[PDB]
Write a protein that binds this ligand. Sequence first.
Ligand SMILES: *[C@@H]1O[C@H](CO)[C@@H](O[C@@H]2O[C@H](CO)[C@@H](O[C@@H]3O[C@H](CO[C@H]4O[C@H](CO[C@H]5O[C@H](CO)[C@@H](O)[C@H](O)[C@@H]5O[C@H]5O[C@H](CO)[C@@H](O)[C@H](O)[C@@H]5O)[C@@H](O)[C@H](O[C@H]5O[C@H](CO)[C@@H](O)[C@H](O)[C@@H]5O)[C@@H]4O)[C@@H](O)[C@H](O[C@H]4O[C@H](CO)[C@@H](O)[C@H](O)[C@@H]4O[C@H]4O[C@H](CO)[C@@H](O)[C@H](O)[C@@H]4O[C@H]4O[C@H](CO)[C@@H](O)[C@H](O)[C@@H]4O)[C@@H]3O)[C@H](O)[C@H]2NC(C)=O)[C@H](O)[C@H]1NC(C)=O
Ligand SMILES: *[C@@H]1O[C@H](CO)[C@@H](O[C@@H]2O[C@H](CO)[C@@H](O[C@@H]3O[C@H](CO)[C@@H](O)[C@H](O)[C@@H]3O)[C@H](O)[C@H]2NC(C)=O)[C@H](O)[C@H]1NC(C)=O
Ligand SMILES: *[C@@H]1O[C@H](CO)[C@@H](O[C@@H]2O[C@H](CO)[C@@H](O[C@@H]3O[C@H](CO)[C@@H](O)[C@H](O)[C@@H]3O)[C@H](O)[C@H]2NC(C)=O)[C@H](O)[C@H]1NC(C)=O
Ligand SMILES: *[C@@H]1O[C@H](CO)[C@@H](O[C@@H]2O[C@H](CO)[C@@H](O[C@@H]3O[C@H](CO)[C@@H](O)[C@H](O)[C@@H]3O)[C@H](O)[C@H]2NC(C)=O)[C@H](O)[C@H]1NC(C)=O
Ligand SMILES: *[C@@H]1O[C@H](CO)[C@@H](O[C@@H]2O[C@H](CO)[C@@H](O)[C@H](O)[C@H]2NC(C)=O)[C@H](O)[C@H]1NC(C)=O
Ligand code: NAG
Ligand code: NAG
Lengths: 333, 254, 208, 105, 290, 119, 60
Amino acid sequence: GDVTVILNNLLEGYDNKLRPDIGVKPTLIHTDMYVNSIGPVNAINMEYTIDIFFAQTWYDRRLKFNSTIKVLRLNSNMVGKIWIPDTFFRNSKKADAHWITTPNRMLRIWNDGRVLYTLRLTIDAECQLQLHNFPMDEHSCPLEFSSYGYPREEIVYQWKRSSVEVGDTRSWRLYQFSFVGLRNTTEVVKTTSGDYVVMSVYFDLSRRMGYFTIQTYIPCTLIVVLSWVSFWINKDAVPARTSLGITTVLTMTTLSTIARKSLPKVSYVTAMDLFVSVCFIFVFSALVEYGTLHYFVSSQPARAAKMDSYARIFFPTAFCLFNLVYWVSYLYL
Amino acid sequence: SNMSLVKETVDRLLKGYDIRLRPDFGGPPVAVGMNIDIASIDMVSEVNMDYTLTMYFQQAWRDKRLSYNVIPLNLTLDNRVADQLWVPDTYFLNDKKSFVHGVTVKNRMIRLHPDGTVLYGLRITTTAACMMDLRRYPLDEQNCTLEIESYGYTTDDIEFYWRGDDNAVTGVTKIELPQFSIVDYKLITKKVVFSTGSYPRLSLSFKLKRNIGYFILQTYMPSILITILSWVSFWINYDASAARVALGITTVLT
Amino acid sequence: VNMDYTLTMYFQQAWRDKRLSYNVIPLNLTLDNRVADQLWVPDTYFLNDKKSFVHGVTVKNRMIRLHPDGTVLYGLRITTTAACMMDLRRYPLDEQNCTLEIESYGYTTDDIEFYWRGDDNAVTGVTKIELPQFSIVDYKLITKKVVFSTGSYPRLSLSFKLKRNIGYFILQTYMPSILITILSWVSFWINYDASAARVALGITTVLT
Amino acid sequence: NIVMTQSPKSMSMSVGERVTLSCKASEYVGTYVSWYQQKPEQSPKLLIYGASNRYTGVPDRFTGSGSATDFTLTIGSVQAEDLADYHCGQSYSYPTFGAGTKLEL
Amino acid sequence: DNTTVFTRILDRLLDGYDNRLRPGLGERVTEVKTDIFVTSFGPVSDHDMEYTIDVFFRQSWKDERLKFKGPMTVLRLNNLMASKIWTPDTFFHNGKKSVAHNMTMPNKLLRITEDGTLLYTMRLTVRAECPMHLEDFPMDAHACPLKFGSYAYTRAEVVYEWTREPARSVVVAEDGSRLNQYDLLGQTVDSGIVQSSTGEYVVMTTHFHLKRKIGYFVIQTYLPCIMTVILSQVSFWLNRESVPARTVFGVTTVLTMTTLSISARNSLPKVAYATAMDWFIAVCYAFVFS
Amino acid sequence: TIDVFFRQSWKDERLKFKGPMTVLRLNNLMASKIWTPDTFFHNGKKSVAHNMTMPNKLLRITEDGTLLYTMRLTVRAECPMHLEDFPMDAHACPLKFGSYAYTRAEVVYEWTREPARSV
Amino acid sequence: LSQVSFWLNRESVPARTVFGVTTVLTMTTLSISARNSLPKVAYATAMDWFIAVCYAFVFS
Ligand SMILES: *[C@@H]1O[C@H](CO)[C@@H](O[C@@H]2O[C@H](CO)[C@@H](O[C@@H]3O[C@H](CO[C@H]4O[C@H](CO[C@H]5O[C@H](CO)[C@@H](O)[C@H](O)[C@@H]5O[C@H]5O[C@H](CO)[C@@H](O)[C@H](O)[C@@H]5O)[C@@H](O)[C@H](O[C@H]5O[C@H](CO)[C@@H](O)[C@H](O)[C@@H]5O)[C@@H]4O)[C@@H](O)[C@H](O[C@H]4O[C@H](CO)[C@@H](O)[C@H](O)[C@@H]4O[C@H]4O[C@H](CO)[C@@H](O)[C@H](O)[C@@H]4O[C@H]4O[C@H](CO)[C@@H](O)[C@H](O)[C@@H]4O)[C@@H]3O)[C@H](O)[C@H]2NC(C)=O)[C@H](O)[C@H]1NC(C)=O
Ligand SMILES: *[C@@H]1O[C@H](CO)[C@@H](O[C@@H]2O[C@H](CO)[C@@H](O[C@@H]3O[C@H](CO)[C@@H](O)[C@H](O)[C@@H]3O)[C@H](O)[C@H]2NC(C)=O)[C@H](O)[C@H]1NC(C)=O
Ligand SMILES: *[C@@H]1O[C@H](CO)[C@@H](O[C@@H]2O[C@H](CO)[C@@H](O[C@@H]3O[C@H](CO)[C@@H](O)[C@H](O)[C@@H]3O)[C@H](O)[C@H]2NC(C)=O)[C@H](O)[C@H]1NC(C)=O
Ligand SMILES: *[C@@H]1O[C@H](CO)[C@@H](O[C@@H]2O[C@H](CO)[C@@H](O[C@@H]3O[C@H](CO)[C@@H](O)[C@H](O)[C@@H]3O)[C@H](O)[C@H]2NC(C)=O)[C@H](O)[C@H]1NC(C)=O
Ligand SMILES: *[C@@H]1O[C@H](CO)[C@@H](O[C@@H]2O[C@H](CO)[C@@H](O)[C@H](O)[C@H]2NC(C)=O)[C@H](O)[C@H]1NC(C)=O
Ligand SMILES: *[C@@H]1O[C@H](CO)[C@@H](O)[C@H](O)[C@H]1NC(C)=O
Ligand SMILES: *[C@@H]1O[C@H](CO)[C@@H](O)[C@H](O)[C@H]1NC(C)=O
């Protein structure tokens, strides 16, 4: 009817290469979001998937009409004919909008020129996780976005009071982590082209320790007590105790390989490989203890007889002390 | 108003413009200056013999046709006008897959200046292929680069140079790698000679040095401890034939 | 593991368009592959494909070829990763059977008619396919008219029958298990006084 | 330099029988050996280009047989005018011709 | 106004140009001269029986509809002008998924000489096929072909040829070898004529002769097999009154041989014949069992 | 993953005609010159619309304006699972699709047959 | 195979030791291979409880 006439009058003498007020003042853009789901945070690539509904609203004095209808509600068929800011996410490894079935976009041009432009995004953002205290570690890793070609003097972003709103926090794919909070931040960065307004949203993720427990902490200690069992077998049965020790060492190194293969290649010492190395050292100590016991049996038997009962008390006590110290130091940190 | 003036200036610049002709199509070569802001070197694979890096590749040339004097400000046009201007045919020789990121728009900048200087930036993610010499793994230093060359235009049609010659590449000292460490980086400007002509070429070469802590902790320590556990078999008396054989065999298996 | 199979074919269609009929020149015109964006070409789709593409090097690999009587030929070079649902109740001694259903999408049976050209020499190059594991035993061409809630659409089927070779499995998993059982049998010739030797034999055998 | 040993060096055949000439290269020359017919006081005329491909104007009795190294040229039922020199020459590298075979009756 | 006179030249050049008809549609046969400059011979994958390559595909024909006389001899035009003229539709008969790099602009090149001779160069990665016979594994030698011809243009319309001597056409860069395991010996070009269901086409074939390096397979299969056999034959020097030790020797050597026979076979595609490494592994297993 | 024939049908009063045929079985390229609803899947991750060999779409314009627009999709949706009975568990994998940029006061969706016989 | 270790006589120590150790190793690798199939989830499944009980049995 007359809405076609309005849309035709808005695009007569319209240049979609020039931002509104190109030579007057910067364009204030209000940005909102809606985090549907924060996908799996894989430590190997130091990245995490997020799915958002990015909404940008600005003022355009050229798309200003005066008719009975107050607001124009449009699909993505009029996005390529008006000006659209070139907001890009500075820490996204690979990100893309959705196109099924029709391009997921929304354009609402109010009566006074205020435009709202909403799109759906699936961003594989990047954040370098400091993999210390593993797996009792907490991260706060961001999502930063800014204009690409427009510096601070041309496009200025600004959060709304209730801008970012998480979803249900129940149907998310956060397996090993647990959402505890978020915070918005705005700063200005320097680049080879100029000064840019960079907005950020920091998500705080806390690794819940329910899986790595049964994956490495239970089998390692059970392997260690398997090694301790040799301290009760009679000292005359040599092959039994040697097999115990050496096969326990083999299983220990295999389990250490798996545990270290969990997270990526990092050149520092975490809290999990520290645990598996202490367990490996304990099994090594048990084996060399039996070796010295057997060597001393030929020289003086009572020495080894006392050594056995001494080790029976010294080994579990040292293990329990180390476990207490380690867990206290790495949990309350 | 100022917007009408800007609109008429841009409509004047883009009217009577031929994309098939570089600036000075008969005269001297065009001078394209390169800047690079490396965001991150994502992954360095020894199995595929390549690495992935994301950069803000930026070029700056002087197009005497896009010159204006009625307004003093630097126009920043929409990134869709780069299909109506001339931009140099710069390609990376050792790339395998690359893509300008396209969220929320095609990530490129195209900014004109009042003296004609055009500034064209991209956000590329190139999987450069660099072959490694693993004869000293993991106590080795890789030196593998990124080569930037012009495809269509020979050296009498285009000239590449770094802008600043030492600040053209930034963001290297801020890169953290989980396994490597950037020792230094070099910027080389030269010419290659193919069967069709002599073409310009730039090279940004990194010298990564591999860390040793993870390898020691993961596969050097178990080797030494298994060797010592093998030595343990010497304290066992020669009468026990089921113990020393078991120790040696299991150490071999480990 | 994906229950699929990737095949590259030269898929050619030939119809009769009366509007592309010329009687001035006597030669069979062959136009660039870019004129196909201005003709009508049938909306053919493979029903059981998952990811497919017309090869685009050095150009979009398609052929358009008119004829002086209006007949049009239209060939593509497709690489379809079709779905091959397998019954593995006899693996690796099984004969598989997976098809390639070629159906027209938009046009009912009163708007298009599919038929193999030759009806036996339509599909060539099957006896030249040399697979590393399977071996094509037979292929059959079928012509049906499927019925959906929006009409009755034509359908062609090209069906293979791949027989899996058993040499590799005889090499990899049958022979080691057989020799491991033979090894386990040695545990009887050892004297029954040896308590660690026979247990070592049995345990290593179970573990292998 | 790829040397071409053409055989036989001199052969005589009567009219009406199939004659076979051979030309064996040293290295690989893949279907890139041409056969020329040089009558006396005349310039050579190309007979068989490629490996087995008659030049436009060549009778159907000349036909070639190609390979990677060894090549043959067969003339079924030679006439009285087929008496000339027959040179094989490769072109996979810089062209090097054979010694030629004198055809007599 | 030099850009203006060149724009006038290019506008007069495409006045009445039909980019759907080859030069000399009914009056001649097109002669496309081909050339290849392999910048990098990628890694030959043994499982997929494929090999990657990265070439500079140069083509050149003569289009009389593009004759021009001006201040310059050759026109080094953009890569988008090549979409408004006729360009041959060469395709690789044994390509799987090849890409034509377009970073940053489309990687192409067009030089229009003043007498109509065109030069059209592309930079493209071809992921070609290379069927292998692995009966001499890992001491085999292959000839990985790279066939390319025309699509939709038979032998009567478009014929291909090499521009320089066929030996000096397919060039390889010096540092252009990403072969970790193989070793490129040399190229070998050839021309042929194939017959399809549509017509009779011209096919340009190029073989790259490869020769596998035994260095890895030695240290990873032949060394452990020989070491296991030696460890097993050590069992004879022990005394006969030691049953557990000799039994452990035997069973551990058998387990090692089994794990090795399973692991080493995993590398190769599932072929139905026995390679050489399989014969070595079988003989070592027979020795341990003996 | 789920391979669907997503069918839609609205009534456009601006597409009434009067000719020899009743239903215009048009080509899939006419669907871009008319209005077609932008139905998006609320939980789909990476859905593809197939392009072999031509765009797998359909358009039948009935003489009274009743349109019909089917696509062939391959939807990869999210199915949140509670793996507390693994491997004796039962799941209910949802597939939610609605409109984008069109609220309830503008575009309402409805099944075309009895809701038990639509999917 | 672990509970079989009870029918052997008390004089043969290395045999019972081998039984015990190899059954514990098999249970460890089975637990790992069973957790590998699932997503890295932070609760305990039914199969996890079954494998824990079997581990308790072999260790006992
Ligand atoms: C190197 O080479 C690469 C390979 O060629 C190249 O990649 C290509 O890049 C270009 C440039 O970006 C892409 O072209 C654009 O793609 C946009 C969306 O891209 C998505 O979709 C395509 C598939 O495109 C189909 O789907 C969209 C969405 O529905 C349609 O809009 C398309 O027309 C097309 O639809 C047909 O096909 C469908 C089947 O798929 C059918 O169902 C349908 O019916 C049609 O038949 C995907 O391939 C993309 O994936 C790639 O990109 C993502 C990006 O993140 C990558 O991650 C991924 O890995 C892939 O690489 C992606 O998913 C299109 O929207 C866009 O079309 C608009 O823009 C152009 C340019 O401005 C216009 O000319 C055009 O007319 C369109 O404008 C209209 O529509 C917009 C809608 O927003 C309106 O706003 C606008 O006003 C205008 O409306 C007018 O026309 C309408 C009709 O068109 C009409 O309805 C209106 O009323 C009005 O009149 C453009 O096509 C191309 O897809 C890439 N291809 C590939 C294979 O990657 C790369 O860039 C090269 N690199 C360099 C450096 O050069
Ligand atoms: C990594 O390897 C590359 C290539 O192997 C090294 O690049 C080489 O760098 C040297 C030093 O600049 C270049 O030599 C120079 O030649 C110019 C010629 O005018 C001369 O003026 C200089 O004095 C110097 O001799 C050499 O050409 C260059 N080679 C290539 C192929 O680019 C690089 O130095 C290595 N190290 C690092 C940290 O990148
Ligand atoms: C899916 O398949 C369809 C059908 O083949 C593809 O549509 C075709 O897309 C190309 C590329 O945009 C169109 O070519 C264009 O033609 C216009 C003239 O209208 C020209 O100005 C452009 O420069 C370009 O050459 C082509 O016309 C179009 N087919 C039809 C019938 O219109 C579609 O691109 C395919 N999608 C993907 C992702 O491959
Ligand atoms: C592979 O599987 C397909 C389908 O599972 C087999 O195709 C089936 O072949 C039989 C025998 O040709 C068809 O029966 C036919 O019925 C029609 C009814 O008129 C009759 O005219 C024919 O003479 C024949 O009796 C059957 O319809 C067809 N399956 C379907 C769904 O149409 C195929 O034989 C199997 N083997 C191979 C080597 O492909
Ligand atoms: C998101 O950003 C907004 C604006 O930057 C924050 O809103 C401010 O909240 C503080 C209290 O925390 C008030 O004192 C300010 O007046 C608010 N600003 C405005 C403009 O209303 C909001 O707190 C941020 N959300 C966080 C940090 O979670
Ligand atoms: C345009 O850029 C130049 C380069 O630094 C700068 O000197 C000038 O001030 C800029 N113009 C404006 C209006 O800021
Ligand atoms: C065109 O094709 C037909 C059949 O393929 C053939 O009979 C005819 O000879 C062809 N035209 C010419 C001019 O050869």
